[PDB]
Structure formats: C-alpha cells, structure tokens
Structure 1
C-alpha cells in the first residue's frame, strides 16, 4: 500500500512483515561484524541474554566490568540504539499479568472468557501507575490474529515515540523486531477483545521517559554536578549550615525527631528551624528531569529485622507475603530520605536485601547533595521529609545465593 509507513499497521500483518523485511535488509547494511555477531548470539540464546540485561546493574561496579556477558549486552545494545525511528510506531506483545503486579491468572488458558470481576480487579491494579521496564524484548509491528502464537491473556499495545531504537532482523523464516526497554509504561486504557474464539485483555500503553543512570555513575555524577553546582551558591547562611549539620550531621536526631512525631508531641525550636531550612534547601533547585534513583534500604523500613524469618526471601512464601503486604501500597517516610543516582551495590550496604527503585517526577523537591564536595561520594540525592512512594511492583533477583527485591516505586509528592 503506502509510500510511507503508518504509525500503526494494526491488523495489516502482510504489509507489516513486508515492510519490516525491507527494513531488516537495510539495517543489516549498517551493523559491524561484532553487532551482527551479537545479533546471532541473541537468536541462539535470547532468554538468558534478555535476563542478564534486566538485572545487570545491581552488582558491585567491579563484578559488572568482569562479567563476560557484558560484551553481548553492550554490543547488542549498540546495534539497537543505532537505528532510531524517525516518527512514532506502535507495537504489540504479550505479557504475564504478574508483570503489572496482578499475581493471579486473568483466566486459565483453557477458559475462553474473562469475568467482569477479573476485569475490574485488573483495572484497579494497573491504574494510575508507572511500571518500569528493562531489557531486550521482541515486539510485533502488527496485532496477532488467527494463527499467531498467543501465550498469555494479556496483550500490550504500545506507542513508541520518535527516536526509539529498534532493530528489525530475520531469524530463520521470521521477521522480528528487537528493542531495549529503558522507560516506564503507563496503561492508558484496558479493553477486552476476542481473538480466535478467546477473550484477551488489550492494554493501550504509552511511555514515560526518565533519566536512569543505572551503573553509569560517572555519567550520573557529571549530570548532577552540572545541575547543582549553582545550588551550593544560592543557599543561605543557615541552610548551608543546617544541611551540612544534616550532611555530616545529625540526620539521626532530625530524623528520629521526625519519626517520633516530635514537632507535634515534643516541639523543639532548634530542630523545627532545622527541618524547615533543609526543606527550603531542597525547594531551591527542584529536580530538573524525570529521574530514577536507587535506595538500598534497611529491613526496618518495612517492619522487619535482620533476624525476622520473613526476611528470608529465598523462600518463595516470604516474597509472596511481602508482596501482599506492600505491593500496590503507598509508603510514607516522615524522615528526610537519602538515595543515589547509581544502582550498583556498595560495601556499606552489600547485604541489604531490599532495593527501592524510585521514579522522581521533574520539579519534585530534592537535591544532588553530591555536587557539594565532601559527601559527594554516595552520588546522593536527598529527598524531602514526608515524601510518599507508591509501590507499583516487586521483583526478585539472585545476588550470589541471596535473593533480593527491587521495589518499582514512584514519588507521588
């Protein structure tokens, strides 16, 4: 049909395939031997390669640089990143509902219909939520129909904006499309459709970009210094002092005072002055882009101790118990709260099992304390007292033999 592709091929399978074939031929012409080699290894070992690409960032900097799987990751990512689309395109793929924190079956595979009750439950669960996505996946340019593989009852229909890296390629008989997820998903709408005799949920999804430095702390640090150098300057006398008193403070007295309900149980002029000065220090230069930050948190933040048998996430029951307790919930820190632009593990918190991966909207109160030399090493972002975080999703991964959790969360104030 047309001289220019649409933004969405919809059910036009045949034009979608023909088009992606030409595009695969064209793109093959721009990949070097190593990128082609990476692509070839991907076809042989896609699942493991994709798995590695999802959790890669969470280890010691030195464990990452010495994983041999890092070559395949970087080379494959360069191949994808090279070919950026010049206008939006929509894609289709199936997900498990567990992916969006719906930890039951929408329906069994043998069932043909979805209850209105499962539908409303699902809508309530996935509504008003940014779900972080990572790693390589194969997507389709057309809506699956009679005769395509349909592994789950959940079909995602995703609009990818202009400049999304996309790698069309051929594997045996098939034309495939590879992307590296590096964004959050908003589900704008769900509808129940029917394909080949069975009801499916179709999620209309769009994308929210955030700066996510992951293990590239150097890039992260450059970025932060570059945006918060002036911040050092525009601070007043007390602010600079109270913040440094917090910084090489001090946070322990302030934060216990906050946690205790001090201001409204046992007022203190000196500390109440201090809380409000720091808050005003964080309103000074609000976060100038959507930003992912990482916090390795202590079990106490989630009502556990290091000896609680519920903190043994190697037993699947305790993961489930944790999800039921926190997943979907909002969570409030009466204290000021410390995070990093980096995702890597560190000596000071090498054994903490719970990682908060927090979405910070542009203009949120907060500061890159690490532009201030001297405690600029934690690559630290300080978030305001009383901050609330919606926990969208809980994932688990293996660090050696220890299971740890990643809490996909969002700053909602």
Structure 2
C-alpha cells in the first residue's frame, strides 16, 4: 500500500520478466511510447472518433495497436489497487481543489467535490502510467487529487523499464465510480484520495464488425418476438415513417395536435423496444446536431473553437439531465461518418442492462448500419463533457448515462 521499496523491486523484476515475452513489434511500440508518451496516450483517448481511413493512416495507430496487445497479454490473476494523480476537471469539477502553493483543502471544497462525483459513473479511456504504492514525500504529485482504483481480475497491466526508472502501463476501457473520498496528508499538504472501482460496459468503439456480430446475435430473432401490429409499425418507422413520428413527438403533438394513429404506432414501437431489453451494459454513440441542445447551425455559441463557448456549454449541460421526446437513434460504433461529417457533438451513452432498446440493423435488408434504437422520452444524465480537435474543428464528447 505505502510499501515503496517492495513494489518497485517487484515492478522492476516483473518488467524484466515481461520484456522477454514481448514481440519485436510490441518492443518497438514500447520504445516509441518511452519517447512520445504524452501524444500516444492522448491519441489512445480519441482515436476512435475519426473516420476509418484517418484511423488507418494515423502515424500513431500501429503503435496504439501493439501497445494495446502487449498490455492484454499480461492479465492480473487477482484484483489489484493502483494509484495515479488526476485533475478534478476529469470528474466535471471545473476548478481547483486548492492551489499548488496552498497546503490545506477546506471542508467546504472537500464536501463540494463529494457532491459533484456522487451517484455518477465516469468513462475512462486511453493509456495510463500507474503506481502500485501510495506516492510519498519524494514522488511527483502533480495534483491535489489521488485516485486509488481497484482494477478487476484479468485487467491487462504492463510493467516496463524506462532508462533507470520503472513504470506500469494500463489501457483504460471502462467506467469508474468513486465510492469514497478521504482527505489525506502527504509531506505537509492535503490531498483528496478517491477510492474508486470499475463498472464494465460493452464498448465496441471503432470495431463496428464485432459490434454487428453482437447485435445480430442478440437481435436476429427480435422480429419474431413482435406481434403483427408491432412488426408492421417498426417496419413503417424504419422505412421512413420515423420523420412524421419523431416530428410529432418533438412538437408535442400528443397535446397540441393529437394524432391517435401516430399515438398507436408510437405505443407499438415502444412495446417492441421493451420486448427484448438490452442484455448487458452497453455503450452507444450518437452524432448530435445543434438543435438537440437548443442551438442552431448559426448559433455563435455552437462555435466550440472558442473556449468561452465550451465553458458555457459545460455550465449549461454538465451534471444536468437531457431528455428526448422522440425515439433516439444511436450506433454501436464511435467512428465519424460522411452523413454527420461536421456535427460537433458526440453523445457517448451508457445503456444499463435491462433498458428498452433494439439493434435494428439485425433486420435483413434494412438500409442502415450498426443502429440501436432507444425509446421515446428517454432521459440522459450528463456526467462529463470533453473536447477534441477534428482537424481544425473543435468537437465535444458528452459522457452520459441513460436513466429511469
């Protein structure tokens, strides 16, 4: 736990042991990592949001895949705790816990951080260097926030040597919940120690073929579980009826201009989506237009190239609920597509096991790929908003959870 001498000796011994296992290509990727860790780790966070050809061609993509593979071949046989420092902004606490010159963290700030991270899951992605022991009076402590994360059995972990130093690499690909926070003292300064655990979610990211295999496996027989009316209304919807149905819902037609024929279709589609609930925690992706967030294509606020507009968007939406009156299309894949080339908001949604939903792309012939349809009137809790550059265009990733 705080046993530095033990963990470093073990870590070094393990590094030198694993080094004999690695493929030449993996050793090559590791050599590159030692030289360019910041940019490779950043790449590993957002690589999957670009086009397939951008992914393929990227100067860091082969390095990513090799490092990914190497990490996976050293799986832990029991659960293990790891330590790493984190920015409070990572958990949507968009301010300092204390300045780096200050020693103390006020009770108010401690409690405010607690309230911010409560009852939320946060998606974690990309390579990370971690420590096996609690950083002490002699280590690099770049932030007032120290994560103490329990990694589950069979998590990949790669100890490696870098000059005279030893580090351990993981690839994050899960959500975390912060179960407890405690104010600790290290070398005369207060830190927040956050006790965290992993919650898993099936997340294909750019691997649309595996996602499709899963979707069809789970929804090939979905049509056969529907009544004649349900199947006919789902068909109508997928064949182009979605426009009239969703416009009616968005404009609150059921109240202001009731159409009982449409009401019936909506009821049938909802029952169809409740017929075979999402069988596991699943991550889906939606490329959202401005109107879904109360903006238009010509809103000055939609220009996320200006930092002011990101801060304004976060202030409005982060930690808040978002509800769609219409049925919501999403994809199992995170890749950009020509149809949504310039859309600036990526909704990254965790669907809890048992939620209404269906993999529509399992229906034969249907011209539409990798699609998961969610129920009308769905509510989404926004945990965290991130930004990234897509060429010259700043885009946003909205980490949300589908809630009751």
Q: Which residue of 1 aligns with 2:316?
A: 325
Q: How does 1:148-163 map to 2 (within 5 A)?
A: 148-163=139-154
Q: Which residue of 2 aligns with 1:93?
A: 84
Q: Which residue of 2 aligns with 1:4?
A: none
Q: d(CA) in 1 for partners of 2:262 and 2:329?
A: 19
Q: How does 1:248-397 map to 2 (within 5 A)?
A: 248-375=239-366, 377-397=368-388
Q: d(CA) in 1 for partners of 2:166 and 2:336?
A: 39
Q: Which residue of 2 aligns with 1:11?
A: 2
Task: Establish whether residue 214 from structure 1 lines up as the match of residue 205 from structure 2.
Answer: yes
- The one-character-per-residue Cα deviations of 1:253-288 (angstroms, maximum 9, x if unpaired) are 212222233323433321121111111101111111
Provide structure 2 residue ranges, at least 5 long, that are not aligned to the other structure.
none
Q: Say if 1:254 and 1:275, in contact at 8 Å, map to a contact too.
A: yes
Q: Displacement, 1:120?
A: 1.6
Q: Which residue of 2 aligns with 1:27?
A: 18
Q: 2:397 aligns with which of 400, 406, 412?
A: 406
Q: d(CA) in 2 for partners of 1:242 and 1:249?
A: 11
Task: Establish whether residue 115 from structure 1 lines up as the match of residue 106 from structure 2.
Answer: yes
Q: Say if 1:216 and 1:342, in contact at 8 Å, map to a contact too.
A: yes
Task: Establish whether residue 180 from structure 1 lines up as the match of residue 171 from structure 2.
Answer: yes
Q: Which residue of 1 aligns with 2:193?
A: 202
Instruction: Name the SS of the counterpart of 2:377 in structure 1.
Output: coil
The TM-score normalised by the length of structure 2 is 0.98
- The one-character-per-residue Cα deviations of 1:54-106 (angstroms, maximum 9, x if unpaired) are 11011111221122311100011111011100000000000011111111000
Instruction: Name the SS of the counterpart of 1:128 in structure 2.
Output: coil
The 10-residue stretch of structure 1 (369-378 or 381-390) with the greater mean CA deviation from structure 2: 369-378
Q: 2:38 aligns with which of 47, 58, 61?
A: 47
Instruction: Name the SS of the counterpart of 1:68 in structure 2.
Output: coil
- The one-character-per-residue Cα deviations of 1:323-351 (angstroms, maximum 9, x if unpaired) are 00101101111111010001111111111
The TM-score normalised by the length of structure 1 is 0.96
Q: d(CA) in 1 for partners of 2:203 and 2:61?
A: 18
- The one-character-per-residue Cα deviations of 1:172-202 (angstroms, maximum 9, x if unpaired) are 2222110000001100111111111000001
Q: Say if 1:232 and 1:371, in contact at 8 Å, map to a contact too.
A: no
Instruction: Name the SS of the counterpart of 2:295 in structure 1.
Output: coil
Q: Displacement, 1:376?
A: 5.5
- The one-character-per-residue Cα deviations of 1:101-154 (angstroms, maximum 9, x if unpaired) are 111000000101111111121111111111111100000000111111110000
Q: Which residue of 1 aligns with 2:71?
A: 80
Q: 1:128 aligns with which of 119, 122, 138?
A: 119
Q: d(CA) in 2 for partners of 1:225 and 1:279?
A: 20
- The one-character-per-residue Cα deviations of 1:212-257 (angstroms, maximum 9, x if unpaired) are 1111101111110111001021111111111111111211221222
Q: Say if 1:88 and 1:161, in contact at 8 Å, map to a contact too.
A: yes
Q: Say if 1:369 and 1:376, in contact at 8 Å, map to a contact too.
A: no
Q: Which residue of 2 aligns with 1:7?
A: none
Task: Establish whether residue 164 from structure 1 lines up as the match of residue 162 from structure 2.
Answer: no
Q: d(CA) in 2 for partners of 1:264 and 1:308?
A: 29
Q: 1:238 aligns with which of 219, 224, 229?
A: 229
Q: d(CA) in 2 for partners of 1:376 and 1:59?
A: 22
Q: Which residue of 1 aligns with 2:183?
A: 192
